[PDB]
Amino acid sequence: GSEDVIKQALKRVQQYIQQAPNGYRDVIQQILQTVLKILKLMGMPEVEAVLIVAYVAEMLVLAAKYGYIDELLKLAKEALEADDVDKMIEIFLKMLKIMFLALALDPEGLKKLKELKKNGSEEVRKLIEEVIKQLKQ
Amino acid sequence: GSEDVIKQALKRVQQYIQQAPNGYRDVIQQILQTVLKILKLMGMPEVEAVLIVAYVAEMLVLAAKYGYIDELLKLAKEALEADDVDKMIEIFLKMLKIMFLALALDPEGLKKLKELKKNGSEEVRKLIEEVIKQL
């Protein structure tokens, strides 16, 4: 169920916003609201928009645990006050790099990142498989 | 409509696979099966792993319309054969760059993207409010 996913994920997000110092909760709640409003105006399905918010929120919380929340805020202000869409995406990509790297520093994140690397062997073969198919084409 | 968004997503993905050149149909199917295995083992809930694959497959289909599918396949192999997790993340970041590049080249996507660049003011102020509190 769609409503089941949105519930699962928005429950996750609300917990993250409750594990934050009070005083920020109201502002985070308002940022949560208007991002959800903006994403819906994109026209992307609500499940997709909510899973995006939830995953980015999870990684925001993780990176805050390794000190990066000041850095990611400053980037967000820079992406939104930016002159063109090109520059916005670049900072968006920069923020993503910081997020994923904190997933690499986190010892549980790094444990799973290494699994994903190891279990990627059966995948490489089937990618090379059809890279081969595509060059002949 | 259908309660099972898994039913909704796999039908959507299967429609992408069913329209690829027939010579890829099976290898893609296998890729879909084992990428599900892996996400499952990353601790992702099966409703979410299936949705990720469909939303990603969507972006692959759009990037393949601008010629980039060869590049994204090569990046995938290189990332999976990287010597360390930080290398892997580096190339994964390049696959995102291609994804955003294709949303911008799509005519509907740039309209929506340009809207945010003119609909980020409200979040800018609330972000700056949070910035001041932290200081």
State how far the Cα of A122 lies from the Cα of A134, in Å rounded to an integer.
19
Q: What is the 3-state secondary structure (H, E, C) of chain B?
A: CCCCHHHHHHHHHHHHHHHCCHHHHHHHHHHHHHHHHHHHHCCCCHHHHHHHHHHHHHHHHHHHCCCCHHHHHHHHHHHHCCCCHHHHHHHHHHHHHHHHHHHHHCHHHHHHHHHHHCCCHHHHHHHHHHHHHHC
> Are B120 and B99 members of one domain?
yes
> Are B17 and B60 members of one domain?
yes
Closest-CA residue of A relative to B112 is: A42
Task: Judge whether A102 lies within some domain.
Answer: no
Segment holding A53, helix H or strand E: helix A46-65
Q: Is the dihedral of CA B107, B6, A103, B126 positive or negative?
A: positive
B45 to chain A: which residues are within 8 Å by CB? 8
> Are B83 and B55 members of one domain?
no
A41 to chain B: which residues are within 8 Å by CB? 112, 115, 119
Contacts (Cβ under 8 Å, ≥6 apart) of B55: A48, A51
Q: Which residue, A12, A102, A31, is CA-closest to A62?
A: A102
Whether A67 contacts A106, CB under 8 Å: no
The answer to whether the CB atoms of A130 and B89 lie below 8 A apart is no
> Are B116 and B130 members of one domain?
yes
Angstroms from B96 CA to nearest CA on chain A: 8
> Are B75 and B113 members of one domain?
yes
Q: Which of B64, B99, B118 is the last residue of a domain?
A: B64
B133 to chain A: which residues are within 8 Å by CB? 23-24, 27
Q: Which of B64, B83, B99 is the last residue of a domain?
A: B64
State how far the Cα of A99 lies from the Cα of B73, in Å rounded to an integer.
24
Task: Judge whether A89 lies within some domain.
Answer: no
Contacts (Cβ under 8 Å, ≥6 apart) of A23: B133
> Are B19 and B50 members of one domain?
yes
Angstroms from A2 CA to nearest CA on chain B: 6
Q: Which of B37, B64, B91 is the last residue of a domain?
A: B64
State how far the Cα of A50 lies from the Cα of A67, in Å rounded to an integer.
25
Contacts (Cβ under 8 Å, ≥6 apart) of A59: A99, A100, A102, A103
- Domain housing B12: 1-64
Q: Which residue, B69, B129, B124, B114, is CA-closest to B95?
A: B69
A47 to chain B: which residues are within 8 Å by CB? 5, 51
Contacts (Cβ under 8 Å, ≥6 apart) of A117: B80, B82, B85, B88
Counting Cα atoms < 13 Å in the Cβ hemisphere of B19 gives 8
The answer to whether the CB atoms of B4 and A2 lie below 8 A apart is no
The answer to whether the CB atoms of A130 and B97 lie below 8 A apart is no
CA dihedral A32, A112, A93, B87 (to 10 degrees): 170
A75 to chain B: which residues are within 8 Å by CB? none
Task: Judge whether A28 lies within some domain.
Answer: yes
Method of determination?
X-ray
Task: Judge whether A132 lies within some domain.
Answer: no
State how far the Cα of A67 lies from the Cα of A116, in Å rounded to an integer.
25
Contacts (Cβ under 8 Å, ≥6 apart) of B63: B69, B72, B98, B99, B101, B102
Whether A101 contacts B86, CB under 8 Å: yes
The answer to whether the CB atoms of B117 and A74 lie below 8 A apart is no
Cα–Cα–Cα angle for A87, A88, A92, rounded to 5 degrees: 120
Chain A / chain B CB contacts < 8 angstroms: 161
Whether B53 contacts B39, CB under 8 Å: yes
State how far the Cα of A119 lies from the Cα of A60, in Å rounded to an integer.
26
The answer to whether the CB atoms of B28 and A89 lie below 8 A apart is no
> Are B78 and B26 members of one domain?
no
- B97-119 burial code (b ≥16 CB/10 A, e <16): ebbbebbeebeebeebbeebbeb
Whether A117 contacts B80, CB under 8 Å: yes
Task: Judge whether A136 lies within some domain.
Answer: no
Q: Which residue, B15, B18, B53, is CA-closest to A48?
A: B53
Number of separate domains in chain B: 2
Angstroms from A18 CA to nearest CA on chain B: 16
State how far the Cα of A36 lies from the Cα of A42, in Å rounded to an integer.
10
State how far the Cα of B118 lies from the Cα of A37, in Å rounded to an integer.
14
> Are B115 and B55 members of one domain?
no
Task: Judge whether A93 lies within some domain.
Answer: no
Task: Judge whether A38 lies within some domain.
Answer: yes
Task: Judge whether A123 lies within some domain.
Answer: no
